[PDB]
């Protein structure tokens, strides 16, 4: 079956470059013309670049917001797509995808993504403080707050606790982002029972678990 | 420049329902249009193709139509795993353009936010390092007001919120908000207070503590 997996994303200077590629396999890579789709977020996704096949020129075409900057190619030999980014700029930060066009123009199939972050702000482990209230049911929280850059995983009791969570998108505030969790059990849940918050933040190798203890 | 205008931007109907969605182009595309469904952390997949073709694993209840400029979507009967975000797409002239997106939401019985507040962990007063928190959980509809007040004059400076998209679990909608301060400032202050200002009521909903 058709499978595109992207890779060479991470988080770059402005005005820095970043080499895109992605491994097309399950269908023949020169018979499909390929483009570049990116997503950020809460926003409609949006087309970059088209490169056509060998039977029709192997020419390009881009978006005019790219142009001149994001460079689309592909090499045969290894069923490879590639984007070519140069003078990278804060708004080009998003999740990009490998994505084909099918018959009727049709843009069918896409890939999982890799993830663009384009900010002076350096890589910073996150905090993570625990949030104990100040009956019937209770209200625990999770503050992950000052670090870079995205993602971060966080969890209740190992993922074992999932339900009444709620887990906000990160915001950033310079700089840093913040990150909340809200858990709500029954009283005679907690502090009965332990309830703990799990985050992760790959980008820094950081693996911390926050006990909420009233 | 082809310009894709799809209205319904948002969308709220309920399980079971018949609900449309449309797409104009601001110039003839034929039939090279498509259909998109996105759910909430996942990538885009094909529903329609060719203005009215049903891609392979795509279920009956889905089926788009129209030429030339005017393009419908329909989903007949929705379901729960019907709530996602649709895009159209014209795959007849460069560049290819997106329509700006419909996001679909349950609809249910209006809930006032059930707010707490959080003073600042001991583990950030030391330090230092403060920030109050405060949720406002499980309300609808969308909309929401939060005040902050310390000694109960309104602060507005560092104040960080969030809103989660529509639980799937009950339809409501949840918002975090996170007041940062100084160690010293907040060590200066005695009482906290989280307003929260709902359609559900002309009073908001006030939590608070003392002690800085």
């Known amino acids: 079956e058709v499978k595109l997996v992207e890779s060479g994303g991470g988080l770059v200077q402005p005005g820095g470059s970043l080499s895109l590629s992605c491994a097309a396999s399950?269908?023949?890579?020169?018979?499909?013309?390929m483009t570049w789709v990116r997503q950020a977020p809460g926003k409609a996704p949006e087309w970059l670049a088209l490169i056509r096949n060998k039977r029709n020129g192997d020419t390009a075409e881009y978006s005019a917001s790219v142009k001149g900057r994001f460079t689309i190619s592909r090499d045969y030999s290894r069923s490879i797509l590639h984007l070519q980014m140069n003078a990278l700029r804060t708004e080009d930060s998003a999740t990009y995808y490998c994505?084909?066009?099918?018959?009727?123009?049709?843009?069918?199939?896409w890939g999982q993504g890799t993830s663009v972050t384009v900010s002076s702000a350096k890589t910073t482990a996150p905090s993570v403080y625990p949030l104990a209230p100040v009956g019937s049911s209770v209200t625990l929280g999770c503050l992950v707050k000052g670090y870079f850059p995205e993602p971060v995983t966080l969890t209740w009791n190992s993922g074992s606790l999932s339900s009444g969570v709620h887990t906000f998108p990160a915001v950033l505030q310079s700089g840093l982002y913040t990150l909340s969790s809200s858990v709500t059990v029954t009283s005679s849940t907690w502090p009965s029972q332990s309830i703990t918050c799990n985050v992760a933040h790959p980008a820094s190798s950081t693996k911390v678990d926050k006990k909420i203890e009233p | 420049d082809i310009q894709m205008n799809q209205s319904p931007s948002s969308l709220s109907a309920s399980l079971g329902d018949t609900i449309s969605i449309t797409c104009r182009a601001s110039q003839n595309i034929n039939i090279w249009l498509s259909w998109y469904q996105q759910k909430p952390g996942n990538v885009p997949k094909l529903l329609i193709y060719?203005?009215?073709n049903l891609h392979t694993g795509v279920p009956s209840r889905f089926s788009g139509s129209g030429s030339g400029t005017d393009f419908t979507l329909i989903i007949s009967s929705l379901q729960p795993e019907d709530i996602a975000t649709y895009y159209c797409?014209?795959?007849?002239?460069?560049?290819?353009?997106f329509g700006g997106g419909t996001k679909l939401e349950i609809k249910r019985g209006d809930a006032a936010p059930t707010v707490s507040i959080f003073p600042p962990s001991s583990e950030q007063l030391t330090s230092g390092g403060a920030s109050v928190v405060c949720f406002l959980n499980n309300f609808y509809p969308k909309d929401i007001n939060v005040k902050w007040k310390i000694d109960g004059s309104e602060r507005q400076n560092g104040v960080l919120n969030s809103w989660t998209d529509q639980d799937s679990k009950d339809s409501t909608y949840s918002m975090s908000s996170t007041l940062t301060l100084t160690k010293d400032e907040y060590e200066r202050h005695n009482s906290y207070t989280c307003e929260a200002t709902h359609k559900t009521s002309t009073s908001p909903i006030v939590k608070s503590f003392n002690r800085g």
């Open positions: 399950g269908f023949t890579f020169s018979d499909y013309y």
């Open positions: 797409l014209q795959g007849q002239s460069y560049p290819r353009t």
């Open positions: 994505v084909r066009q099918g018959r009727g123009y049709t843009l069918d199939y």
């Open positions: 060719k203005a009215s």
